[PDB]
């Protein structure tokens, strides 16, 4: 029966399962648990620029919360 076609679709679906999942893992690895920041407006990009400027490490993910206030 079609128990013998499910290996074919099984392996090919695993071949389609992989790229988004491994890509999302590389997204999370490229900013250390963060998600890569999307960028569609000038507003978001300027906020990202001041964020990567204030961080000191010139990197927009360290996210520098509440421990440089005073």
């Amino acid at each position: 029966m079609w128990f013998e076609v499910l290996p074919g679709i099984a392996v090919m679906g695993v071949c389609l399962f992989i790229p988004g999942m491994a890509t999302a893992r590389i997204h999370r690895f490229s900013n250390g648990g963060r998600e890569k920041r999307v960028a569609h407006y000038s507003y978001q990009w300027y906020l990202m620029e001041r964020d990567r400027r204030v961080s000191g490490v010139n990197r927009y993910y360290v996210s520098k919360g509440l421990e440089n206030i005073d």
Binding site: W2, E4, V5, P7, G8, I9, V11, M12, G13, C15, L16, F17, I18, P19, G20, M21, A22, T23, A24, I26, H27, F29, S30, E35, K36, V38, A39, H40, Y41
Partner: protein, 303 residues
């Protein structure tokens, strides 16, 4: 890391296309009363491996060409289109977030029209030129339709990000407020991939082969984002990618399943059918999907 991202996209396409070819052979074998290929190893995964490496081995078409550079220049373009269409496709996180991606989809469909036409001119004697010319005609007559329909379904969501699309699919599937528009869209995807029930009756045959099947997987993934699917809780993307893969596979099996059982159309029936029936119906759905979001207080947050 970014070149690792690119190679993790365009390494599994060979796996996907080869195993899609054995899957179409198997599924037709069971729509028909056959089994196999299963003498080539267990169930035949080495069967696409074997015929792929055979077609590489087998001695090429001797030229017999006109402008060697043009003749190499057509299929290189076809395959690099089939690669460069999977960049803005989010399963949950796309490779490149864009301001607009669906117009990029349609643009690369038109470059596929270029592939067909260049291979047809640089091909051969005159009869294949007439055949490829009819093929370009019946391909280009549907990019009116599919662009129209894609426009009228994104007008429900107003923006072009496609991640706003995966947001706005969260409550209902988008098949419910647009079923006839989605139906006609799916028929136009059968037109663009140029399969049965639509006629086309080369070198290198592997490259045209590859572009065909990657075009099919392209349109299926784009459908599966576009009209159905489910939610995505963040910090768990295996969940959405699983449901995405399963729905796209069911749709591609349905695609080949529709291919299995219908005879090919007469050509003037195809053009006649497109113009006189899909074109006024598309205009009807466009004018109603314009005038209805202005009715039901439902205009999207196009940020």
């Amino acid at each position: 890391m970014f070149m690792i991202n690119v190679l993790t996209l365009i390494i599994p396409i060979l796996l996907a296309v080869a195993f899609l070819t054995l899957v179409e052979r198997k599924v037709l074998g069971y729509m028909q009363f056959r089994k196999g290929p299963n003498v080539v190893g267990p169930y035949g995964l080495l069967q696409p491996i074997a015929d792929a490496i055979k077609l590489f081995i087998k001695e090429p078409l001797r030229p017999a060409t006109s402008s060697i550079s043009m003749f190499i220049l057509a299929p290189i373009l076809a395959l690099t289109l089939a690669l460069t269409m999977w960049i803005p496709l989010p399963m949950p996180y796309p490779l490149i977030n864009m301001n607009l991606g669906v117009l990029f989809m349609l643009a690369m469909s038109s470059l596929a029209v270029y592939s067909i036409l260049w291979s047809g001119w640089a091909s051969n004697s005159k009869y294949a030129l007439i055949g490829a010319l009819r093929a370009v005609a019946q391909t280009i007559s549907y990019e009116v339709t599919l662009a129209i329909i894609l426009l009228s379904v994104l007008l429900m969501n107003g923006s072009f990000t496609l991640s706003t699309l995966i947001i706005t699919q969260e409550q209902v599937w988008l098949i419910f407020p647009a079923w006839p528009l989605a139906m006609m869209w799916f028929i136009s995807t059968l037109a663009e991939t140029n399969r049965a029930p639509f006629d086309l009756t080369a070198g290198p045959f592997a490259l045209f082969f590859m572009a065909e099947y990657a075009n099919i997987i392209m349109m299926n993934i784009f459908t599966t984002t576009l009209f159905l699917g489910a939610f995505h809780n963040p910090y768990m993307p295996e969940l959405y990618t699983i449901n995405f893969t399963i729905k796209s596979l069911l749709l591609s099996i349905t695609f080949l399943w529709i291919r299995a059982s219908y005879p090919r159309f007469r050509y003037d029936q195809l053009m006649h059918l497109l113009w006189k029936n899909f074109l006024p119906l598309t205009l009807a759905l466009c004018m109603w999907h314009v005038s209805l979001p202005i009715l039901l207080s439902s205009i999207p947050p196009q940020t």
